[PDB]
Amino acid sequence: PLYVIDKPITLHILTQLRDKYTDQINFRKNLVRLGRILGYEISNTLDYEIVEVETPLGVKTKGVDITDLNNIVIINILRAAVPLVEGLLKAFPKARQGVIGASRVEVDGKEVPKDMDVYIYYKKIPDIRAKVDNVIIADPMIATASTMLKVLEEVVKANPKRIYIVSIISSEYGVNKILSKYPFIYLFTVAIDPELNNKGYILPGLGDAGDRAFG
Amino acid sequence: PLYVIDKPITLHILTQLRDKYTDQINFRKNLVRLGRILGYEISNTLDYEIVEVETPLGVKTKGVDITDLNNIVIINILRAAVPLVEGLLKAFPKARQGVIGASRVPKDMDVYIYYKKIPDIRAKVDNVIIADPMIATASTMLKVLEEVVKANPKRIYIVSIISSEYGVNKILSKYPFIYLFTVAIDPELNNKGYILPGLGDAGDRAFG
Amino acid sequence: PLYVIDKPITLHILTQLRDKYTDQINFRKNLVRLGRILGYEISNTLDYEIVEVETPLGVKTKGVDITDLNNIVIINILRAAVPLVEGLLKAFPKARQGVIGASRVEVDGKEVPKDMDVYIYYKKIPDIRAKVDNVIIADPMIATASTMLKVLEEVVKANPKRIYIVSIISSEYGVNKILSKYPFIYLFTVAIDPELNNKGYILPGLGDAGDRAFG
Amino acid sequence: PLYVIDKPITLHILTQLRDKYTDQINFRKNLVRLGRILGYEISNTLDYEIVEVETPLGVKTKGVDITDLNNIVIINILRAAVPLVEGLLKAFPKARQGVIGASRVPKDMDVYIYYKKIPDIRAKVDNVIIADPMIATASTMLKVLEEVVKANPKRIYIVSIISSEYGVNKILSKYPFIYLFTVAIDPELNNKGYILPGLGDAGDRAFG
Ligand SMILES: O=c1ccn([C@@H]2O[C@H](COP(=O)(O)O)[C@@H](O)[C@H]2O)c(=O)[nH]1
Ligand SMILES: O=c1ccn([C@@H]2O[C@H](COP(=O)(O)O)[C@@H](O)[C@H]2O)c(=O)[nH]1
Ligand SMILES: O=c1ccn([C@@H]2O[C@H](COP(=O)(O)O)[C@@H](O)[C@H]2O)c(=O)[nH]1
Ligand SMILES: O=c1ccn([C@@H]2O[C@H](COP(=O)(O)O)[C@@H](O)[C@H]2O)c(=O)[nH]1
């Protein structure tokens, strides 16, 4: 399933992120804001039970309990995802965190990259509980989807209850590549850009998310 | 306009607020969360302008700019709105904030403003957001609105967690242009003016 | 006792607060920072116990437990103390909060005010456990100390274990008025300004803290 | 110089980190807290200039400006420094941040840098802060310093939570000019290279 969260405020924030004049401090501030917002949107898609609660007025009434808020594992793809994850963690205070350091092998060919070698320089992920945990993989940008696909090949083996992918900008090619292979993944993004340049960067995109956030 | 924000997560949070076992620390924590969420929902109803920005890729593309974010006045109705406003202020950093308290001296008992300190409201420009976690008889909200409507702001938003059917109808019938945001609308008020099922006295729940 | 927290970074932050050109957003941001810092400094004065803790290496070693982190009541003096309290709550996540709305009856040029009438328009304070709770009264500015004295009159009756007063700027007069009457109160401040003008404002001070933060 | 920040609150937080029962959520929360605290302590060792500011009362008074806050490069040694650096970056919002990882293959087994992405360090101007919650044999820290010192930064700070007596001496004997901040200095290391009593493998404690 594809969830494009393109409401006025999210597009307003995204505009700030795209703007090449937005410095690191403000870029991070806006990315955290989007992490909170996407966490909110994701929360509204989680399973939930109807419960009964007693108010101070001695009366009982129906309520809602999203039990899955207790079963979340967020995978932080360094370096770029750090601010996004900080925002997501605000939405899921009980989420355990896992980290994956990923970097693409740069390219500059005569044609637009379809695939790219991704080397994982660091990996520490908590035990994912099959059929129980909801895994949220966070990475601001999805271009060729090579990074996400490499992370997914491992996550899918854990057989989580559900897999969410949270990005800010995904390319049409990337979204297609992910959902066509894993059609049951919940892919959240704010905008879907049409293309990539010869270097594998998203156009219009926002540049290298890592550098935009931390220089 | 009535905006009942009853999404799974807001209903989950409301459940924690209603729960008598939720202590003040957790009660306030949830009120802050709702302030942020309602601020987000409100932000999506504001006017916006299409702008152009250039990305680091040296390409220009269309963007969005909600200029209204620069013109906001948040009014904290004294009782248990401090946490709600904390959240709203995170949603609207450029907002100026004021406080106002009303007290008495299925209910139309007259209330009066005992204290008020609200920043200058710019007519036809400012979007005023009035926060109060609970709207029961609506006497308090109506009294505050009487004051606010005089400033002739561009828009008036009301942010509440639980509003009574009675209060919702009374407010929106008198001021149909107001944007009333609430998480739930409870059916009745007891003899003492409490919302049933409600969540008790918000002041006691937050600072008691 | 008096604790003047005037380290380079707090003075740097205070400089931003004093600057008339610092907007509401940055004034609040810096006040929150001072709340965190003052919370940190206050924490280092709390009673604590030496405990034993087992590390993953299968060995036990000495540790510290500031049990009183669980026994704190923070009194938020509206409307100016809000951001300060926000920061303090970061240092004391288990603190219960109480609120007091206070507003001084304004006075014109006649004689530098020695005391003033303080109107308490709102009050909701949690139960303070005598001899157990540590009460922290937060208010960015202490000028004539009229506001603080009015709040203390009630707080002292609860006979808390200890009373802390946290301000950003206090006047020499205010500090004297508080400690001379309540010598056992722990008064924390970043700077002590020499005087008050004819309207009871601290000089050089930073203006009306409420307006500086919220307009 | 050696700066052991062993105040009641840091020792309290350290105790929670050492506690084998503290889960990763709370372990990371406490690391962020120490990042902020150590950032505060580091901030107080920086140079500052005297400036004048005008208050709303229309008078000018002396103020302080820590210009060094504009020139900071934070290096995250890969293992469990993410939460630590999160706190440090809150302390130094203008800081640029990089990452670096070193691996192998009472101990001197050599390490090598397998990955590094660090922003440009301005010689004689930048204050570089290298973060790693644990300093055991110090092989990793020394390996990282090899490259950093080449940038000739104005100052080099090291931010750790627990450092071994061996590592503290080794680093500061080789680089006497480095500002090493740590919360505690533990006496020994075991065959595997763990600090005793320490707190275990920080990476597992934070993300395991
Ligand atoms: O315009 C772009 C394209 C890619 N990336 C980085 O590349 C990774 C994904 O690219 P890909 O593997 O989807 O091609 C992400 O971790 C992200 O940091 C960017 O930062 N900006
Ligand atoms: O169940 C209730 C009903 C009302 N109120 C509070 O009592 C005041 C009176 O509201 P109203 O009856 O004027 O609507 C308001 O501050 C409101 O938040 C509560 O805390 N809980
Ligand atoms: O320069 C000043 C002097 C006083 N106050 C306000 O007055 C109260 C304290 O003044 P006093 O009662 O100590 O005279 C505080 O709540 C504070 O908001 C200011 O904001 N700025
Ligand atoms: O008890 C220990 C000892 C070391 N390390 C980690 O192992 C690596 C090796 O440190 P060193 O032996 O090179 O000092 C570093 O990333 C350090 O954080 C731990 O997590 N726990």
Swiss-Prot record, chains A, C:
Keywords associated with the record: Allosteric enzyme, Glycosyltransferase, GTP-binding, Magnesium, Nucleotide-binding, Transferase
Cofactor: Mg(2+)
Control of this protein's activity: Allosterically activated by GTP. Inhibited by CTP and UMP in combination.
Associated pathway: Pyrimidine metabolism; UMP biosynthesis via salvage pathway; UMP from uracil: step 1/1
Binding site for GTP: 29-33
SUPFAM superfamilies named among the record's database cross-references: PRTase-like
Disulfides per UniProt: none
Note accompanying the cofactor annotation: Binds 1 Mg(2+) ion per subunit. The magnesium is bound as Mg-PRPP.
GO cellular component: cytosol
GO BP of this protein: GMP salvage; guanine salvage; hypoxanthine metabolic process; IMP salvage; UMP salvage; uracil salvage
Catalytic activity reported: UMP + diphosphate = 5-phospho-alpha-D-ribose 1-diphosphate + uracil
Binding site for uracil: 202, 207-209
Residues binding 5-phospho-alpha-D-ribose 1-diphosphate, per UniProt: 79, 104, 139-147, 208
EC number: 2.4.2.9
Enzyme class, UniProt record, top EC level: transferase
Pfam families assigned to the protein according to its UniProt record, in alphabetical order: UPRTase (PF14681)
Molecular function in Gene Ontology: GTP binding; hypoxanthine phosphoribosyltransferase activity; magnesium ion binding; uracil phosphoribosyltransferase activity
NCBIfam families: PRK00129.1 (NF001097), upp (TIGR01091)
Subunit structure: Homotetramer.
Protein function: Catalyzes the conversion of uracil and 5-phospho-alpha-D-ribose 1-diphosphate (PRPP) to UMP and diphosphate.
Family note: Belongs to the UPRTase family.
Protein name listed in UniProt: Uracil phosphoribosyltransferase
Record organism: Saccharolobus solfataricus (strain ATCC 35092 / DSM 1617 / JCM 11322 / P2)
